[PDB]
Amino acid sequence: ALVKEEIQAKEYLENLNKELAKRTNVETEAAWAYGSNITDENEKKKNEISAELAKFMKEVASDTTKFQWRSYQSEDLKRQFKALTKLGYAALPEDDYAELLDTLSAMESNFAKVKVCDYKDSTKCDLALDPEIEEVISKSRDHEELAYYWREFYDKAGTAVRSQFERYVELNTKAAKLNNFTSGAEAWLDEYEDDTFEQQLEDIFADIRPLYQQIHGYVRFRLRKHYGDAVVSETGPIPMHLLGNMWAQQWSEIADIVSPFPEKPLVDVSAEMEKQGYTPLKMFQMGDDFFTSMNLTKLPQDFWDKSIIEKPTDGRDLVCHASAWDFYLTDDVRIKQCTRVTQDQLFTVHHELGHIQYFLQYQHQPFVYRTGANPGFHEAVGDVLSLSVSTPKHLEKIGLLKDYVRDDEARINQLFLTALDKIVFLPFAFTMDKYRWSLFRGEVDKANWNCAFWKLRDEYSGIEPPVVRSEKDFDAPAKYHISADVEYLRYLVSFIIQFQFYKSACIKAGQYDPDNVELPLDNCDIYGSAAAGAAFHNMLSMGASKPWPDALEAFNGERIMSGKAIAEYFEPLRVWLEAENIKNNVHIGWTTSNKCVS
Ligand SMILES: *[C@@H]1O[C@H](CO)[C@@H](O[C@@H]2O[C@H](CO)[C@@H](O[C@@H]3O[C@H](CO[C@H]4O[C@H](CO)[C@@H](O)[C@H](O)[C@@H]4O)[C@@H](O)[C@H](O[C@H]4O[C@H](CO[C@@H]5O[C@H](CO)[C@@H](O)[C@H](O)[C@@H]5O)[C@@H](O)[C@H](O)[C@@H]4O)[C@@H]3O)[C@H](O)[C@H]2NC(C)=O)[C@H](O)[C@H]1NC(C)=O
Ligand SMILES: O=C(NC(Cc1ccccc1)P(=O)(O)[C@@H]1CCC[C@H]1C(=O)N[C@@H](Cc1c[nH]c2ccccc12)C(=O)O)OCc1ccccc1
Ligand SMILES: *[C@@H]1O[C@H](CO)[C@@H](O)[C@H](O)[C@H]1NC(C)=O
Ligand SMILES: *[C@@H]1O[C@H](CO)[C@@H](O)[C@H](O)[C@H]1NC(C)=O
Ligand SMILES: [Zn+2]
């Protein structure tokens, strides 16, 4: 009978979860070694261990059918069993799985090994994205130099892996169908446990889109005054290489030329960090300080002993796109970041430590629950702190911002600066997965794959390549997450929900009151707030033990993903910007791009 079986099932899960942590530890160690040191030997080791774990997962999924788990009384037990039935890529036949792993490492290693030649010196051909190319894209205001680096990078990181990407799409689809999802789109969306999730995001995006159009319009106007109308047209999509980022995902790097009030202060603390002798170690210690100040968990000794926080100075190849690592034991958590001493990197450190904090908060949970409530939650944690770190309030406290007068004009500058990071990103993030979903779902013919990418970038973001592209190019994998097969919707979700978290954390900290002019949301610092920390502990400690609305409820009593909070934060900017665009007769919207030839 079922009563006795459910008792046996509980013991089965308890033992199996422990076995899964231990087996995954081994896979994670091999993946860490490869990411830290790209070699053919390490590639082989990583992929062989994964193949072994996949084989065990197949046996696990098979064993779940021996339990009448759908008949059980315990929602908790049922939730754990359901999690075990979900094989993902491990559902593929042995050979197909091995081919997929080979395809994935081929794409990640290609991305990591990209080197271009110096614009001024065709002899020097050892410039990597991190840090050499990214430095030029962010700092150069020479549009031809910018276009050179754009083309060189996209050709090498994107086009070079078209055939691999094609095989990846095929195997991803085969895997999804073996799990009885329609495609990889549905497989990814399953992580949000909500059949209306896509529509919810369409609705929120539609609400924020008009504000994005205004920012777009204003930035284009300002870029015309800098580069001239030969480079930037009034009515067309913005040439993306002028936006301070290789993928135009955030535009904060060009704030100095597009800021609302150029004669007023613009927060840029990179120079002060260098002046005060900041190091990657100091930055991480400061991040640790922020979490502990909120009564959250201190970084364990394993973290300091084992993390890589600076780019290695030997000749080795490695993945320099930052990552946080859970090894599924106790306190064995790690970061690999090629850290630089900049304002942006200080935020990145806090983002990374948000992942690490989540690992520590839920490490007592059964293995299947040791992940985010949904992927967006994991990405949001560190950003909530970064929002307060970025405030003039906090930056003055740590002596990085000097002689600052927070008048109305300085406030608009700061809000705009934040919008260039937070609002601008929304259409970008949506398109990363809208694109891959359409390929996964078989909605785009292979002959149209490249211009399908640029069409979305045009439609949603109103940006375009600096030069004419065609179906002879393949540009999507020039973005890390696309080469590395990392779902991107998590970041769109994060950028929305992080303002729900921030607003509530600020209210809890007594740092935000909508009726108190002295406590604006955009200058809230949650540093040292145990009350804000309590909310985080209540939520993060749950891991994936409950559907995400219950985790949100544990934080602030709400159960609904909402764009209300992000709109609330940016409302003073919206009012000012709508008026400024009218005052300057700023053209809003864009004609269809001519930069991708069919
Ligand atoms: C994705 O969807 C797939 C369907 O599109 C699905 O594939 C199906 O999985 C079924 C298992 O759940 C499987 O059903 C079995 O069928 C066997 C015979 O099928 C053969 O002939 C078919 C032609 O008619 C072919 O198409 C097949 O390829 C096969 O060759 C049966 O022998 C088998 O039966 C046994 O098991 C049932 C299970 O009973 C349940 O559990 C307990 C038993 O302890 C019961 O008390 C309880 O009431 C409950 O019913 C027993 O009742 C029975 O006595 C036998 O022991 C079973 O029906 C099916 O064949 C398979 N394919 C298809 C095309 O349907 C995938 O599993 C899905 N994948 C995922 C990951 O979810
Ligand atoms: O390490 C990562 N992940 C990252 C990348 C990665 C994923 C999978 C394998 C390997 C690596 P990253 O998001 O820290 C990560 C590394 C630094 C920035 C982050 C990023 O990619 N951000 C996005 C979005 C973005 C751009 N600018 C910003 C600024 C602030 C927040 C996000 C953001 C990007 O495109 O780079 O994941 C840890 C994890 C484990 C288990 C569950 C959940 C999470
Ligand atoms: C990189 O890996 C090689 C073998 O693949 C190993 O011999 C070497 O020690 C590693 N290098 C570093 C710097 O760890
Ligand atoms: C710190 O957190 C602990 C539990 O983690 C809690 O019991 C304690 O009240 C918190 N300290 C403060 C000052 O709130
Ligand atoms: Zn992250």
PDB file of all heavy atoms in Angstrom, residues 22 113 224 234 237 320 324 344 468:
ATOM      1  N   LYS A  22      27.308  14.622  -4.292  1.00  0.00           N
ATOM      2  CA  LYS A  22      28.648  14.062  -4.341  1.00  0.00           C
ATOM      3  C   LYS A  22      29.115  13.782  -5.776  1.00  0.00           C
ATOM      4  O   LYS A  22      30.263  14.062  -6.124  1.00  0.00           O
ATOM      5  CB  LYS A  22      28.699  12.797  -3.476  1.00  0.00           C
ATOM      6  CG  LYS A  22      30.079  12.371  -3.050  1.00  0.00           C
ATOM      7  CD  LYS A  22      30.726  13.366  -2.101  1.00  0.00           C
ATOM      8  CE  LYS A  22      31.794  12.668  -1.278  1.00  0.00           C
ATOM      9  NZ  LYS A  22      32.981  13.526  -1.065  1.00  0.00           N
ATOM     10  N   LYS A 113      39.114  31.857 -26.783  1.00  0.00           N
ATOM     11  CA  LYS A 113      40.411  31.953 -27.460  1.00  0.00           C
ATOM     12  C   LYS A 113      40.495  33.058 -28.518  1.00  0.00           C
ATOM     13  O   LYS A 113      41.536  33.226 -29.157  1.00  0.00           O
ATOM     14  CB  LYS A 113      40.789  30.604 -28.079  1.00  0.00           C
ATOM     15  CG  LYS A 113      41.289  29.573 -27.078  1.00  0.00           C
ATOM     16  CD  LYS A 113      41.466  28.222 -27.746  1.00  0.00           C
ATOM     17  CE  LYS A 113      42.009  27.192 -26.778  1.00  0.00           C
ATOM     18  NZ  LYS A 113      42.019  25.834 -27.389  1.00  0.00           N
ATOM     19  N   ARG A 224      24.415  62.300 -32.252  1.00  0.00           N
ATOM     20  CA  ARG A 224      24.474  63.119 -33.470  1.00  0.00           C
ATOM     21  C   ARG A 224      25.321  64.378 -33.274  1.00  0.00           C
ATOM     22  O   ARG A 224      26.057  64.780 -34.173  1.00  0.00           O
ATOM     23  CB  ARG A 224      23.069  63.508 -33.933  1.00  0.00           C
ATOM     24  CG  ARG A 224      22.275  62.379 -34.579  1.00  0.00           C
ATOM     25  CD  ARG A 224      20.862  62.824 -34.906  1.00  0.00           C
ATOM     26  NE  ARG A 224      20.849  63.902 -35.899  1.00  0.00           N
ATOM     27  CZ  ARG A 224      19.917  64.848 -35.974  1.00  0.00           C
ATOM     28  NH1 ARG A 224      18.915  64.870 -35.104  1.00  0.00           N
ATOM     29  NH2 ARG A 224      19.998  65.781 -36.916  1.00  0.00           N
ATOM     30  N   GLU A 234      19.143  60.853 -37.837  1.00  0.00           N
ATOM     31  CA  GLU A 234      18.071  61.210 -36.908  1.00  0.00           C
ATOM     32  C   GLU A 234      16.994  60.129 -36.835  1.00  0.00           C
ATOM     33  O   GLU A 234      16.410  59.903 -35.776  1.00  0.00           O
ATOM     34  CB  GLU A 234      17.423  62.538 -37.308  1.00  0.00           C
ATOM     35  CG  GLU A 234      16.291  62.989 -36.374  1.00  0.00           C
ATOM     36  CD  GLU A 234      15.584  64.249 -36.835  1.00  0.00           C
ATOM     37  OE1 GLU A 234      15.518  64.492 -38.060  1.00  0.00           O
ATOM     38  OE2 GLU A 234      15.086  64.995 -35.964  1.00  0.00           O
ATOM     39  N   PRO A 237      18.025  53.370 -36.993  1.00  0.00           N
ATOM     40  CA  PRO A 237      18.560  52.698 -35.809  1.00  0.00           C
ATOM     41  C   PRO A 237      19.957  53.213 -35.473  1.00  0.00           C
ATOM     42  O   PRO A 237      20.713  53.594 -36.376  1.00  0.00           O
ATOM     43  CB  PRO A 237      18.635  51.229 -36.239  1.00  0.00           C
ATOM     44  CG  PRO A 237      17.667  51.111 -37.383  1.00  0.00           C
ATOM     45  CD  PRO A 237      17.790  52.424 -38.095  1.00  0.00           C
ATOM     46  N   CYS A 320      37.323  33.966 -19.360  1.00  0.00           N
ATOM     47  CA  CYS A 320      37.347  35.170 -18.522  1.00  0.00           C
ATOM     48  C   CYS A 320      35.970  35.787 -18.275  1.00  0.00           C
ATOM     49  O   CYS A 320      35.856  36.728 -17.492  1.00  0.00           O
ATOM     50  CB  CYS A 320      38.320  36.235 -19.060  1.00  0.00           C
ATOM     51  SG  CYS A 320      39.987  36.273 -18.293  1.00  0.00           S
ATOM     52  N   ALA A 324      30.180  32.174 -10.893  1.00  0.00           N
ATOM     53  CA  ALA A 324      30.140  31.744  -9.501  1.00  0.00           C
ATOM     54  C   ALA A 324      29.826  30.249  -9.445  1.00  0.00           C
ATOM     55  O   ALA A 324      29.042  29.740 -10.252  1.00  0.00           O
ATOM     56  CB  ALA A 324      29.107  32.544  -8.728  1.00  0.00           C
ATOM     57  N   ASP A 344      32.196  49.663 -12.770  1.00  0.00           N
ATOM     58  CA  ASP A 344      31.395  48.574 -13.326  1.00  0.00           C
ATOM     59  C   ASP A 344      31.771  47.222 -12.719  1.00  0.00           C
ATOM     60  O   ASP A 344      30.897  46.411 -12.409  1.00  0.00           O
ATOM     61  CB  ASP A 344      31.541  48.515 -14.853  1.00  0.00           C
ATOM     62  CG  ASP A 344      30.585  47.520 -15.489  1.00  0.00           C
ATOM     63  OD1 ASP A 344      29.400  47.478 -15.077  1.00  0.00           O
ATOM     64  OD2 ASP A 344      31.007  46.778 -16.404  1.00  0.00           O
ATOM     65  N   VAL A 468      27.373  46.477 -43.066  1.00  0.00           N
ATOM     66  CA  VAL A 468      26.416  45.550 -43.654  1.00  0.00           C
ATOM     67  C   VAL A 468      26.820  44.097 -43.386  1.00  0.00           C
ATOM     68  O   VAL A 468      27.949  43.686 -43.679  1.00  0.00           O
ATOM     69  CB  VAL A 468      26.267  45.781 -45.186  1.00  0.00           C
ATOM     70  CG1 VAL A 468      25.233  44.833 -45.773  1.00  0.00           C
ATOM     71  CG2 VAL A 468      25.877  47.225 -45.480  1.00  0.00           C
TER      72      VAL A 468
END
